[PDB]
Design a protein around this ligand. Sequence first.
Ligand code: NA
Ligand code: NA
Ligand code: NI
Ligand code: NI
Ligand code: NI
Ligand code: NI
Ligand code: NI
Ligand code: NI
Ligand code: NI
Ligand code: NI
Lengths: 172, 172, 172, 172, 172, 172
Amino acid sequence: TSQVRQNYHQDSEAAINRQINLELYASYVYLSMSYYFDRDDVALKNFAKYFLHQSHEEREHAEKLMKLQNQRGGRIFLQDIQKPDEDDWESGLNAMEAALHLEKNVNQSLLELHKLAHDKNDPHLADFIETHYLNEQVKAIKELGDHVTNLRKMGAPESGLAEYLFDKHTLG
Amino acid sequence: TSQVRQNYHQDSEAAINRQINLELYASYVYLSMSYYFDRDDVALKNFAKYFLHQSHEEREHAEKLMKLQNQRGGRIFLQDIQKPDEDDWESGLNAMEAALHLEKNVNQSLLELHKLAHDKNDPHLADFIETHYLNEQVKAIKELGDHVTNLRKMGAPESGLAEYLFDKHTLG
Amino acid sequence: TSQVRQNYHQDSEAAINRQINLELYASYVYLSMSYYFDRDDVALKNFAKYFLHQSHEEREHAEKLMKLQNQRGGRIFLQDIQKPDEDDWESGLNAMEAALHLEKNVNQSLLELHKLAHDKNDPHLADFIETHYLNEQVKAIKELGDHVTNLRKMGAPESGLAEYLFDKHTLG
Amino acid sequence: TSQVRQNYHQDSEAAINRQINLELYASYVYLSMSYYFDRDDVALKNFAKYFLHQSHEEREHAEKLMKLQNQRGGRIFLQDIQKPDEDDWESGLNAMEAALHLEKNVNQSLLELHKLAHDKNDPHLADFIETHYLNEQVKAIKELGDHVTNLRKMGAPESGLAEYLFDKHTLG
Amino acid sequence: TSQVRQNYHQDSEAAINRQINLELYASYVYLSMSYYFDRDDVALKNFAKYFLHQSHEEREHAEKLMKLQNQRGGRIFLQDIQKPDEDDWESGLNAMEAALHLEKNVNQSLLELHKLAHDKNDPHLADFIETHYLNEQVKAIKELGDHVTNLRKMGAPESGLAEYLFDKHTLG
Amino acid sequence: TSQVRQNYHQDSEAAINRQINLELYASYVYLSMSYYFDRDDVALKNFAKYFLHQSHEEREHAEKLMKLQNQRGGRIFLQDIQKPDEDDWESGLNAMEAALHLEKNVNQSLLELHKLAHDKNDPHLADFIETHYLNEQVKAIKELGDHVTNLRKMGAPESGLAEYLFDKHTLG
Ligand code: NA
Ligand code: NA
Ligand code: NI
Ligand code: NI
Ligand code: NI
Ligand code: NI
Ligand code: NI
Ligand code: NI
Ligand code: NI
Ligand code: NI
């Protein structure tokens, strides 16, 4: 038992570790998307920059979660970061939809973790997840939905010119 | 066959992918060290910052390798980033020695890759590894050896005061 | 025999002269493309500026090669700069593909020259070609491949509007 | 027939193309002189810089002529740029006299072209050649004559010290 | 065996030590030339400054070589710095020719060392010598050859006025 | 006999040459110490910087002595710079004591040279040695004695932590 541990259950520690691993997996998937849009036959630099920024944001998420785990007295247990389920993300709209699904899964996991923290009578972790992630994930999901809608309203993926214009005007 | 592929063997592509995975593993190990020195019972902030910077440098290494793979016409195939073989790095000198061993392994892998590139008559990748990694890895190994020597000449790990002074004066 | 000649074979001198002539031919082809996109019935100013910049870069390449020839004690022997095999480059995508083929030919010639220099035990010229041209040609080939991919993903050459948009957004 | 062609004869177009080729040949000869004065056994850097600047000026001349050809509705037809008739320009005074002869030949060609334009009732091309080249060629010929006179009044080519002093004080 | 030694043969270490001693000898010869041109009966200050700068450059060469030896795990073994074979360097052209011969000998030694490093499969030391010395020695040899040519084209050593003018205009 | 020689004995010239050789030997020993503290198993950067600065100061001493020799009409005769009697300076306190002994020997040589100059009725060289070296050597000996005392009052060489603290706080 750590000297700084106070009102911190072991289930919350396991959930924090699992969310750390989930954020690592999300950053891995975002990096995979970024360097898939870096290929010569794809040639979409703005999508690559955006997905690299998203991977860095998920890295910051994981770092903040590990710092919070070290603060609450819990111990960190890292696991194997699984590779993305895909290596060729087809087009831009497919990558945006996959990122939207990943963000929704991360949001569901964060909501389950906050429900657990509320059941554990842990207001600190509750408000931490509320102010540091919930609104962030909501904004990210809204932005990805807007991007998917704009890509569908232009002819993608059937129109590569539409994806080029979305790379230039929107993500540029 | 890519339209930009020219004097680029498939063995070189596989070696580039394996080196990308190795750099990812090195960054993972460095992040594990950094957040192991972030624990409350450890309390060494400068070691954490240094290992986080090393993890970011290995991330930049992997990104540059993936960019070079995309330039030479080869395709990227990511794998599962294995977790570090340890979760408790004992003390500071043990972590420095483990980082030294990891750097020496990465240097051996880079030397084997350069030998392969020379056997494939690929001067571009050869000089790329020469100017972008070889001297960098040599400097890193020399710095880690100096750190290990200074830690051994102060009483570490038997003297926690020595590790504190090395964290304050050297890595501070 | 020059007083400054040292570890410099005559075959390397002939190869340097041939590469100088090749760079001159490449600059001539780039200037031809630039002023073909300057015609009234073509009207693509950004393509003209880009090809003029590429011609100036090949001119700098030839000047650096002649300076290196004067440094290594060898003598320069200039030949007739052949005219481009075409006077009407059809459209923009055709010109980009021709520039890609020319860059790949120049890269193959540089790789053969570096192989010869390695067989002549000339590390100076080897590293010179490695650091001053190899990565440059790789970047140029990658950029031309990205341009060709973007032109093919927009409707060119069947869509002149696509070529206009590529001239405005990309090369503008 | 171009939509912008107006009062522009085909003979004027052929003369413009021939003058473009002549300016290209002049730039080639100037570059040959510049890199002949770059040799180790010659060692005259200021002469090399001056001849390189003259080659760049002839390149600008050719570019302006091609732009004027594209403006007047005519089409450009490039030919093979012949190599200079010499590869060893003896000394500095010989190179200056050869440059003077080349400038006088270019001036004669420009005067013949202006006479043709006047016979074709083309005042635009006439005044263009008058204001953009005639006075320029006159100034260049006067400067080359002054340089030849100063080189002859110092002992060149029989005095290499005279050529060194002309490189240092005059062209420096 | 050092903890940082990796892919570093003992023959390469001996060659590095011998090259360190050679650079020390070159710096000694350059200092001897500099302070020979400092004598009252000689009175050539610019030659003294130039040779002192060359001696300092050879000192920096030796320091960089010793730093590289300390980096690659090898141990440094210094020897006796031999005095220059001459104490009166006759004139300026003789000193320039002696410096040219010394630079050519150092270049031959560096080329032999790079050949040895390539035979030892050491790309790090190979590229180090390539980028940090080879082009530097080539530029130095070219500059010394140009200086010798200019001194021979002015009347030196039979004309002390020529040496004075070379000291004032060139090396001044 | 030089035209500028006046009240300058040949014994004073020989003593000046011997002192030049002694300063060269001192600079060599200081450089050896500096690059001995540069080794990986030593790892003391501040000691290396201090000894390199001392070597540069002895180099300036030798240069000033050679300039004074050229001023007084005497001729310079350089000899072989002997290597240091040691290649492994044990620890920091041993190197400081060796530097102190070398400084005391140089001071004794300078005092003997000043006594000779006074016996030769040479006030110029006397006051030159007085104002340009005597107080400098006294300050250097006092500083080295203070360093040795501080190293002995901390536990060196039996305490490597003491040497590390002296490198950080004092020489840092
Ligand atoms: Na190289
Ligand atoms: Na006095
Ligand atoms: Ni996240
Ligand atoms: Ni790395
Ligand atoms: Ni080889
Ligand atoms: Ni080129
Ligand atoms: Ni012209
Ligand atoms: Ni008329
Ligand atoms: Ni050197
Ligand atoms: Ni001294």
